[PDB]
């Protein structure tokens, strides 16, 4: 029966289903979301930053546990996992990942979690720090590259002369020097998450190596 | 002054300052060239086309790579050389992200690594997944690279809360004894070129067994 935390945040990710795009978030707009004024999500929110540290924390609590059975391969790749499907689940959830500092208890410990997971499996704290931020990256850098070529291939589907023209002139120089290479990669777009997981087991069988 | 180049410098200046590509605007750019946004559109028929030929910009910049023949050595060495060509441009991953690659230079060099696994036996599959995976590695770990200076930045210049949140996260690792990411700490390293040549090593240390199981 009154404004809240939650009422906000719940209302910044609607904003966020309109117009996936996290600079656009404003305060104002959040609060245009609820029918209030900019004033009144101060209250609660001293900045926007305050208020996507809170999202973050949101986004958190949806993850699921994954299932361990102690082996530290099928563990760690049961984490990937799981956060490719958080990170599908809302708008903007990398860039905000991205844009915050994990200062909330449930990131610490997943954190915390999938790294004891390879210190105790044997790798030095250097090497499960590179691998656990290194996993994080291939996520990031795919779900954003996934996001943003998601929209472009739409762009073209849906009658943009410009980039249309973009495409037919990357098609025609590709063909006009036979780049044999990139003409069958055109082709995958590829199932995005058997890609990810592809991805990582093949990180995973590096670490294995050496 | 106006010329496609002049824009083209004037657009990255302006990200240099605030490297948030989702803050240019083609009236932003006029402004700081000291004109209104007609003069500009007369060169770019749209912010698209400015990102085109800004990402265009970036792969001229390009260092080419002397290879050797051998897949795990010049892949590496490609991948080496995108690092340095992403720390001269403000958003470099951003403007990849957000423009197709139709342009000439970026066709070339992706047709090519992509032949480095080819020829060395890697299924078509496996040299897609393994070329945009290492690229996504790259994407993530710039950007994750350049949020933490601009964050440490805001801090330095007297944020209170974020500098109070950075202090919240430390309570919590010693509040749950979070043995792993208190030494997860003393890492400024994971953000270095050499911690990007290890992951990488990785991944093509996997691909020596990977789709290798699937290839030939
Ligand atoms: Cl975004
Ligand atoms: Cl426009």
Known sequence: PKLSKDTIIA???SLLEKSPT???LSM???AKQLGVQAPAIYWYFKNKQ???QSMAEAIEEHFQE???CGEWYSDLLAFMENYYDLYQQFPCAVAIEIQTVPAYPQRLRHL???MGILREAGFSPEMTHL???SLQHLLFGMIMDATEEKQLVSQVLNGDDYLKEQVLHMKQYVSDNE???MEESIQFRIHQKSAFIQAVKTYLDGLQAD
């Open 11 to 13: 209302a910044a990710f």
């Open 50 to 52: 305050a208020l996507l």
């Open 22 to 24: 996290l600079e656009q």
């Open 179 to 181: 780049l044999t290479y």
């Open 112 to 114: 915390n979690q999938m």
């Open 28 to 30: 104002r707009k959040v």
């Open 66 to 68: 994954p299932a361990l």
């Open 131 to 133: 691998a656990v931020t």
